[PDB]
Write an enzyme that holds these catalytic residues in place. Structure first.
Site, PDB file in Angstrom:
ATOM      1  CD  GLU A  55       1.583  -5.545  -4.022  1.00  0.00           C
ATOM      2  OE1 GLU A  55       2.789  -5.849  -3.904  1.00  0.00           O
ATOM      3  OE2 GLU A  55       1.196  -4.412  -4.382  1.00  0.00           O
TER       4      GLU A  55
ATOM      5  CG  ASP B 103      -2.060  -5.015  -7.408  1.00  0.00           C
ATOM      6  OD1 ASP B 103      -0.987  -4.935  -6.777  1.00  0.00           O
ATOM      7  OD2 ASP B 103      -2.831  -4.046  -7.567  1.00  0.00           O
TER       8      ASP B 103
ATOM      9  CE  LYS C 252      -4.018   1.846  -8.255  1.00  0.00           C
ATOM     10  NZ  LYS C 252      -2.665   1.442  -7.787  1.00  0.00           N
TER      11      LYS C 252
HETATM   12  O1  R6X Z   1       2.240  -2.325  -6.754  1.00  0.00           O
HETATM   13  C1  R6X Z   1       2.407  -1.308  -6.032  1.00  0.00           C
HETATM   14  O2  R6X Z   1       3.565  -1.010  -5.635  1.00  0.00           O
HETATM   15  C2  R6X Z   1       1.220  -0.427  -5.637  1.00  0.00           C
HETATM   16  N1  R6X Z   1       1.493   0.916  -5.063  1.00  0.00           N
HETATM   17  C3  R6X Z   1       0.368   1.803  -4.666  1.00  0.00           C
HETATM   18 BR1  R6X Z   1       0.735   3.554  -3.919  1.00  0.00          BR
HETATM   19  C4  R6X Z   1      -1.075   1.344  -4.842  1.00  0.00           C
HETATM   20  C5  R6X Z   1      -1.352   0.002  -5.415  1.00  0.00           C
HETATM   21  O3  R6X Z   1      -2.476  -0.349  -5.551  1.00  0.00           O
HETATM   22  C6  R6X Z   1      -0.228  -0.893  -5.816  1.00  0.00           C
HETATM   23  O4  R6X Z   1      -0.515  -2.150  -6.353  1.00  0.00           O
HETATM   24 MN    MN Z   2      -2.668  -2.237  -6.533  1.00  0.00          MN
HETATM   25 MN    MN Z   3       0.835  -3.743  -6.535  1.00  0.00          MN
END
Ligand code: R6X
Ligand code: MN
Ligand code: MN
Length: 179
Positions: free
Chosen positions: A62, A90, A116
């Site tokens: 990330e 991430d 998730k």
């Molecule tokens: O990687 C991403 O783009 C993403 N997007 C969201 Br909505 C929540 C997350 O925790 C995350 O890692």
């Molecule tokens: Mn995330």
């Molecule tokens: Mn992410």
């Protein structure tokens, strides 16, 4: 403004710049979508904290642009055989040899955990959810980090929430489900 000023005062410049890049790529204005702005900043900071708490244990995925992030993921998969994930995670844990998806939610940690897990649909990506109330939920109740690091993340999240509350911004943020 208000939310913009709070974001600029509570997050480091690098994190704010990364979040502004993310929103400019999404096509969203951070002066209009203030809650999403703050959510992205908070998630970035939690990821960076998680990583810093490691002989170099975690690879941060990330915070990179899509191309670099997938380059990193592909190199990891090619040098470990770990199955490539469907969605960009991430972090990667070199000690456990597994990808980590970090979640920060204003709702109950188990609701967002279910969300998730249903989303990523990959049994091999580890999931760690933090709330703004000092609660957490992780795959198999395996929290990866030691107590002190998780406590520091929890404290930072609670402090962000209290900073928003003192500025009258918490209600909108909590109801804004930008996460
Ligand atoms: O990687 C991403 O783009 C993403 N997007 C969201 Br909505 C929540 C997350 O925790 C995350 O890692
Ligand atoms: Mn995330
Ligand atoms: Mn992410």
């Amino acid at each position: 403004s208000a939310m913009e000023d709070f974001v600029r005062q509570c997050f480091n410049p690098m994190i704010v710049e990364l979040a502004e890049k993310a929103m400019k790529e999404y096509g969203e204005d951070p002066k209009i979508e203030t809650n999403k702005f703050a959510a992205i900043c908070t998630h970035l900071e939690v990821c960076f904290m998680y990583s810093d708490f490691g002989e170099h244990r975690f690879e941060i995925i990330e915070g990179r642009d899509r191309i670099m992030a997938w380059t990193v993921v592909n190199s990891i998969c090619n040098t470990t055989g770990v199955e490539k994930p469907k969605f960009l995670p991430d972090l990667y844990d070199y000690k456990e040899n597994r990808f980590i998806e970090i979640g920060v939610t204003r709702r109950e940690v188990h609701i967002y955990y279910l969300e998730k897990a249903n989303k990523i649909k990959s049994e091999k990506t580890h999931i760690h959810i933090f709330s703004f109330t000092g609660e957490e939920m992780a795959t198999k109740a395996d929290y990866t980090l030691d107590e002190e690091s998780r406590a520091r993340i929890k404290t930072r999240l609670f402090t962000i929430r209290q900073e928003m509350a003192s500025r009258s911004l918490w209600d909108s943020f909590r109801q804004s489900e930008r996460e």
